[PDB]
Amino acid sequence: ILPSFIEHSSFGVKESNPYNKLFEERIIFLGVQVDDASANDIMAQLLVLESLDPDRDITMYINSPGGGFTSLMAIYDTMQYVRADIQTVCLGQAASAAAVLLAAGTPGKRMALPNARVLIHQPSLSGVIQGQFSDLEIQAAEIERMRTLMETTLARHTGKDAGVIRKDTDRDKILTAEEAKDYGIIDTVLEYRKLS
Amino acid sequence: ILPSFIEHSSFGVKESNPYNKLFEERIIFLGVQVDDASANDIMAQLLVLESLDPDRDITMYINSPGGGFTSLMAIYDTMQYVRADIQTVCLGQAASAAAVLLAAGTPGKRMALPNARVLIHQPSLSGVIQGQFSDLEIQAAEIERMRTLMETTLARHTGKDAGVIRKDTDRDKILTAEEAKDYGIIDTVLEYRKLS
Amino acid sequence: ELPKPAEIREFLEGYVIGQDTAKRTLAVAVYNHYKRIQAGEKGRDCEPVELTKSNILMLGPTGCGKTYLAQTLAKMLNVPFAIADATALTEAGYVGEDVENILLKLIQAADYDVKRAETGIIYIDQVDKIARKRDVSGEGVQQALLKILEGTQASVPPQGGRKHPHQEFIQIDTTNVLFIVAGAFAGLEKIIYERVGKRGLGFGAEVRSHFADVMPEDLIKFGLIPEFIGRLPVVASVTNLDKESLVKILSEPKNALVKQYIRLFEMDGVELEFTDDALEAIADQAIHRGTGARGLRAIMEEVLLPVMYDIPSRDDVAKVVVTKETVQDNVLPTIVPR
Amino acid sequence: ELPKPAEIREFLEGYVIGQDTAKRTLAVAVYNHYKRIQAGEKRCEPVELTKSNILMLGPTGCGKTYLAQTLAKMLNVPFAIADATALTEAGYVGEDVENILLKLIQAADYDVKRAETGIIYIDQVDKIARTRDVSGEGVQQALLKILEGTQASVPPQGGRKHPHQEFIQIDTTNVLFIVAGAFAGLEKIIYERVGKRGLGFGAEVRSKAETDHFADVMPEDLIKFGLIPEFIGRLPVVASVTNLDKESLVKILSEPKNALVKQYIRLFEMDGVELEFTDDALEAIADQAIHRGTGARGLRAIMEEVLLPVMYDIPSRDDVAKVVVTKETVQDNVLPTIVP
Numbered sequence A, B: 001i002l003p004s005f006i007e008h009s010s011f012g013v014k015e016s017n018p019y020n021k022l023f024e025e026r027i028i029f030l031g032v033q034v035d036d037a038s039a040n041d042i043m044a045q046l047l048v049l050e051s052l053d054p055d056r057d058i059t060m061y062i063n064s065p066g067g068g069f070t071s072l073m074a075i076y077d078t079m080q081y082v083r084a085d086i087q088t089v090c091l092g093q094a095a096s097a098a099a100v101l102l103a104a105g106t107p108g109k110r111m112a113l114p115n116a117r118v119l120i121h122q123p124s125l126s127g128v129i130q131g132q133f134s135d136l137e138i139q140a141a142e143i144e145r146m147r148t149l150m151e152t153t154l155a156r157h158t159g160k161d162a163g164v165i166r167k168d169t170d171r172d173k174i175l176t177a178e179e180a181k182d183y184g185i186i187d188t189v190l191e192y193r194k195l196s
Numbered sequence C: 001e002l003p004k005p006a007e008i009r010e011f012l013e014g015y016v017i018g019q020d021t022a023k024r025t026l027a028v029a030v031y032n033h034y035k036r037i038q039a040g041e042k043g044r045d046c047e048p049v050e051l052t053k054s055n056i057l058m059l060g061p062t063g064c065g066k067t068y069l070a071q072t073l074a075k076m077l078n079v080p081f082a083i084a085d086a087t088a089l090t091e092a093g094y095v096g097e098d099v100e101n102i103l104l105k106l107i108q109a110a111d112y113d114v115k116r117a118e119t120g121i122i123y124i125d126q127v128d129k130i131a132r133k134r135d136v137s138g139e140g141v142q143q144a145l146l147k148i149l150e151g152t153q154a155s156v157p158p159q160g161g162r163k164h165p166h167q168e169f170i171q172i173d174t175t176n177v178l179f180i181v182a183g184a185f186a187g188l189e190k191i192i193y194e195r196v197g198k199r200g201l202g203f204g205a206e207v208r209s210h211f212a213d214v215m216p217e218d219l220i221k222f223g224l225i226p227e228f229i230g231r232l233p234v235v236a237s238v239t240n241l242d243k244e245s246l247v248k249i250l251s252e253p254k255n256a257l258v259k260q261y262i263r264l265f266e267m268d269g270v271e272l273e274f275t276d277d278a279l280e281a282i283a284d285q286a287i288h289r290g291t292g293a294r295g296l297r298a299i300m301e302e303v304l305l306p307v308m309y310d311i312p313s314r315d316d317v318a319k320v321v322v323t324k325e326t327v328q329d330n331v332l333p334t335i336v337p338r
Numbered sequence D: 001e002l003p004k005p006a007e008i009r010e011f012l013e014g015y016v017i018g019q020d021t022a023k024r025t026l027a028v029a030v031y032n033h034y035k036r037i038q039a040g041e042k043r044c045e046p047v048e049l050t051k052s053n054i055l056m057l058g059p060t061g062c063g064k065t066y067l068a069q070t071l072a073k074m075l076n077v078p079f080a081i082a083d084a085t086a087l088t089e090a091g092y093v094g095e096d097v098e099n100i101l102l103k104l105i106q107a108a109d110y111d112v113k114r115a116e117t118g119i120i121y122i123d124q125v126d127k128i129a130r131t132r133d134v135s136g137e138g139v140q141q142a143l144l145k146i147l148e149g150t151q152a153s154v155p156p157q158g159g160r161k162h163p164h165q166e167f168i169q170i171d172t173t174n175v176l177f178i179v180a181g182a183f184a185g186l187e188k189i190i191y192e193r194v195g196k197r198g199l200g201f202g203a204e205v206r207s208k209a210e211t212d213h214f215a216d217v218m219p220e221d222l223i224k225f226g227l228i229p230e231f232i233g234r235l236p237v238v239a240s241v242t243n244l245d246k247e248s249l250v251k252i253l254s255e256p257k258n259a260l261v262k263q264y265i266r267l268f269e270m271d272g273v274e275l276e277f278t279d280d281a282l283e284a285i286a287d288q289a290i291h292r293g294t295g296a297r298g299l300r301a302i303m304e305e306v307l308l309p310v311m312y313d314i315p316s317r318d319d320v321a322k323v324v325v326t327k328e329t330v331q332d333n334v335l336p337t338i339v340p
């Protein structure tokens, strides 16, 4: 359930759900799994917010469990393409593709929350892909293309060697926010700002 | 069933729930299980209500069986982040993760209705995580990090030692409203205010 | 003579309370208007400069003294003054008032002498209500005033020289005719707050809990064409009146509000008095009334409504409105004659 | 012979700073107007010349009227400043489009053969555009016969047409029609064709502080604006007034003949107080005038804003000099050079 409020803006009596209000303040929200249908949404929002103002920062909230690699690199390329700097904030988990999108933000502008979880791991095939050994040789050279491209991506954004990413993403490397700050996924753990 | 009209006014298809009425009075409602989609909703509402007025207290109603840990710490961090104090009110139950959000209110502002229960227990894995023993050693260091993080969260909000949270959340520790006041989850068992 | 801006403001202080930045603006700009007259009518170098007017756009909430600061300014001008509304104006064409009838109001205020009316001041009231988002009374009035606000050889369409059936038009040069325009611009303080306020949201961005920082892009987002704001370089910035100004608006000005109620009770032979706590209690209920100093009257008409009914049916000499009569409706002290 | 376009230019440069393209045009076009009137006395000439009317485009306050008001001051040809918003289609209230010919005949001192060789400046023809629309598109309908040249019966009543009177017959086949307008929604229409998209991959998205110079404008863009296709073809010359940059607006403050800084130094001299500016201050005033975004009119919006605490205090005092600095532009105060 999502309650909807009313904004008395230049017009007033404008009904708005909190997600439209995030997007009005240039906050793209990645809270669902990174699949094609989610990546299609985020890339459309990244191009709209680049068009509305290419100078103001787009903020990307990441509560995603991560997902498809081509959906990852669809969002990744659009985050890197737009003229606006991307401010990635991790809210809860950034796992799999999401931690790559979390590291994909503009340097200086990658945040998490103090109890956020950053889970980096190598690509995996969801379920068994079957076929002839010539088919499987293609699919395995492809997931090594995906594994190398993910580590090359995390090498550009964490400042680590891609072989260091390869040793770290052998298993599920779960980082906390302070551990992902030292790793280079983020560089701000984002202290709480409550007045009390 | 939920009574709700649609005013149109040739500007919108404007919906009016009782939840929209509660959200106008800065009442965020956690009435479902804390999953990603619930946590995504609650965090978007906490940030909207911080932006609308960061001085007035957000109220969070909690009638929830509790769910995922990263969805928990998504809501938890966004609660602790916003400049507004958070009045957590327990309705009926706050179990598992939702008792942590109930304790996560501002001190003095954590309420429970008199027949609400507060169910605290250690994190679990719903279902079996398969894998090699190196994968499972990662997943078990994770569930111990989740357990330690939940206990140190309940330590800093109940004023208990985190080892006392260990011995209490070893099994299901169901508290009443008055037992959660003595434990430190809530600060006020909320008195009835009926005219008669 | 050329009364200085301190002397113009001192006249404005006698009627208008508060409004320092608007009185200083409308005293400086009237003084610059008095100086660009007898510099275009006398001439001297070096490099002899043809001066050009700086028209005024007044902006502030209702009741806060935009029209009243112009009506006060009307009572001191050595130049012709024409007050006019833009809500009656239309673009040249459609049925409403033409934008050269505001020049006819200035020709009529100059006793049909065009050389004095070329030195005049026109006050176009309610230019926030010719605002756009075609519209012929709220988009095309910008398009029609803009030739007048910059200076043109306009000709007034009725009544050229007391209606001779040949040459019903007389020329007027609006180059040296100062224009003061005004309006509430009620939705504009929500527009200005988007820029100078920065209502931010979310993790990171700063979260926060009006007419003095007015850029032309705010007036375009209010809906006014970009040509129309450039003719109005001066923003007067009328401010919202607090409690401490509304107490003084009751009693300090020449035609003050409680001065014209004690005048009403003197027609009944009754000396109306106010405790100073009652004047504060009236102004406490006028800032909540939300209509400026026009809401000071709305309080005193209902504080004095049971008083104004029975007091002319009685023999009294003194009536004292205490603070207990204002915060809730209270009985009458009524000092009997003696 | 009959002042050259470089000579018309250097008169315009004495008043107008910048707009070099829209000063070559209106020097060329006025010289071509002069050569057409010079050819209005004949010997042997088997070819007759046409108007070449001017549609002058540019953003607000950047000098279109001020180009025409300057061009009024040299012209040797009668000159009417008209306004298209004042006009209305015939049969309807308000003025009709034969008033702008009367304003030329009045400018020619009721010498019609001089007014048949005139120049009319119709100001703000972007405001005649897109149920009859008597004040918009209907003006363009009534005005195209005036632009291309017709035997127009002009009422000497003052401008309000009414069917019975003697008229003034004027021929506008040699009257030049400089027309102008802000065209505030046209740079988006031009950008739809000459530019890339405003959105998406492989597009050119632009900052909010950066107008097209109105130099890529074509009638494809002007029909989509709201001008009828008949009105545009009768305006063959495109004059592009450009948005004034910082380097032009620092010159518009101090360099021209009735320059803005010269206006205020004149105002303070009438208080007996010498006004002067540091050059860093004039650059700071022209900085904030691009932020106003109303052209050279935004310069006056700052000079009144900077000198408002000054012009209240100076006439009540005794000073000799004033020195306005960058700090007196970014922070409102007053600090004269108090007289010995």
Ligand SMILES: Nc1ncnc2c1ncn2[C@@H]1O[C@H](COP(=O)(O)OP(=O)(O)OP(=O)(O)O)[C@@H](O)[C@H]1O
Residues within 6 Å of the ligand: C015, C016, C017, C018, C019, C060, C061, C062, C063, C064, C065, C066, C067, C068, C069, C183, C184, C249, C253, C292, C293, C294
């Ligand atoms: N600053 C002031 N000092 C003294 N009296 C004031 C002041 N402002 C308003 N008033 C009183 O309020 C009445 C209305 O003033 P005015 O016409 O200026 O309001 P306004 O702001 O122009 O209204 P609106 O904006 O709704 O057109 C006047 O009769 C005047 O006596």
Ligand SMILES: Nc1ncnc2c1ncn2[C@@H]1O[C@H](COP(=O)(O)OP(=O)(O)OP(=O)(O)O)[C@@H](O)[C@H]1O
Residues within 6 Å of the ligand: C052, C150, C227, D015, D016, D017, D018, D019, D058, D059, D060, D061, D062, D063, D064, D065, D066, D067, D124, D181, D182, D252, D256, D295, D296, D297
């Ligand atoms: N290039 C320039 N050089 C010097 N002064 C200029 C220049 N451009 C504009 N100005 C100044 O700006 C003022 C307004 O100019 P103008 O009357 O041409 O307005 P405009 O921009 O044509 O308005 P609109 O576009 O709405 O017709 C003039 O008084 C003039 O002194």
Ligand SMILES: CC(C)C[C@H](NC(=O)[C@H](Cc1ccccc1)NC(=O)c1cnccn1)B(O)O
Residues within 6 Å of the ligand: A065, A066, A067, A068, A069, A070, A072, A095, A096, A097, A121, A122, A123, A124, A125, A126, A143, A146, A150
């Ligand atoms: C680690 C990053 C690169 C992404 C992680 N896993 C992958 O690489 C994902 C896992 C996945 C998700 C949904 C459907 C199918 C497969 N890999 C792919 O998307 C994928 C798709 N086609 C061929 C090969 N791999 B994440 O989803 O756990």
Ligand SMILES: CC(C)C[C@H](NC(=O)[C@H](Cc1ccccc1)NC(=O)c1cnccn1)B(O)O
Residues within 6 Å of the ligand: B065, B066, B067, B068, B069, B070, B072, B095, B096, B097, B121, B122, B123, B124, B125, B126, B143, B146, B150
């Ligand atoms: C006690 C608090 C921390 C939360 C309780 N349970 C958990 O810790 C939850 C139980 C759960 C819920 C939904 C899906 C999967 C697992 N733990 C997790 O969210 C979780 C998720 N991934 C790995 C390990 N644990 B509650 O939901 O009973």
